[PDB]
């Protein structure tokens, strides 16, 4: 079902860009573990910076996992998740700490979590 004529052009482009970013991040880990982060170019540093946040934002808190997470679950509409990932790709939330993206749901919950953390 992941085709432009089924999900829409914007959804398709966002999904493909996310996959491209994650694939690029996968290749960087091998050289990072050896030569450190300082030797990367500015483009690769930005790729790592955004890929980490994307990977954390793909997490979610489930309703049936309260016994494991300690918090109630969330339901996220597809329009909301598309818009949130588009904003992350555009860099609207580069200043947010990457731990604020874990197990939240909607994009506004990331902002609320970071505000609670004191950012």
């Amino acid at each position: 079902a992941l085709a432009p004529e089924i999900v829409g052009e914007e959804h398709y482009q966002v999904a493909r860009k996310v996959q491209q970013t994650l694939q690029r991040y996968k290749e960087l880990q091998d050289i990072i573990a050896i030569l450190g982060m300082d030797e990367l170019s500015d483009e690769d540093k930005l790729v790592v910076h955004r890929a980490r946040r994307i990977q954390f934002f793909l997490s979610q808190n489930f309703h049936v996992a309260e016994q494991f997470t300690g918090q109630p679950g969330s339901y996220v509409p597809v329009k909301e998740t598309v818009r949130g990932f588009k904003e992350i790709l555009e860099g609207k939330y580069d200043h947010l700490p990457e731990d604020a993206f874990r197990l939240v749901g909607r994009i506004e919950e990331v902002v609320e979590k970071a505000k609670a953390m004191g950012v």
């Binding site: 309260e66 016994q67 494991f68 300690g70």
Partner: protein, 125 residues
């Protein structure tokens, strides 16, 4: 109506013993010369531990099976068979053991499938 705790100090050793018996009885072998029903052996054993309902008296039996891995390979045949049966596992690592952290539980690879419901309210909080 009582409560029972059972510890099986090595399930891999009965796996070896059952393999020996099956080979001696001329039953054709499978992976790693193990018989076909090596999974059924352990599943049949471990499914008998349960928490009974109130109509059945409310008794319980709880089990602690043991599996010994080779070189910390948690993805081997018998370890994966046993992991697929139980309600969670506690994985101990030699590298953690020598680095000073004991009892050396690897938090990433350990999990409890009943977690939260099996805790006091304060501990859960």
């Amino acid at each position: 109506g009582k409560h029972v705790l059972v510890v099986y100090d090595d399930l891999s050793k009965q796996a070896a013993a059952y393999r020996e018996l099956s080979l001696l009885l001329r039953r054709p072998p499978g992976r790693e010369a193990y018989p076909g029903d090596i999974f059924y052996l352990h599943s049949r054993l471990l499914e008998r531990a349960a928490k009974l309902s109130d109509a059945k008296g409310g008794g319980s039996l709880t089990a602690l099976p043991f599996v010994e891995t080779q070189a910390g390979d948690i993805s081997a045949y018998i370890p994966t068979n046993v992991i697929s049966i139980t309600d969670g596992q506690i994985f101990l690592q030699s590298d953690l053991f020598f680095s000073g952290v004991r009892p050396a539980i690897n938090a990433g690879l350990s999990v409890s499938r009943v977690g939260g419901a099996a805790q006091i309210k304060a501990m859960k909080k």
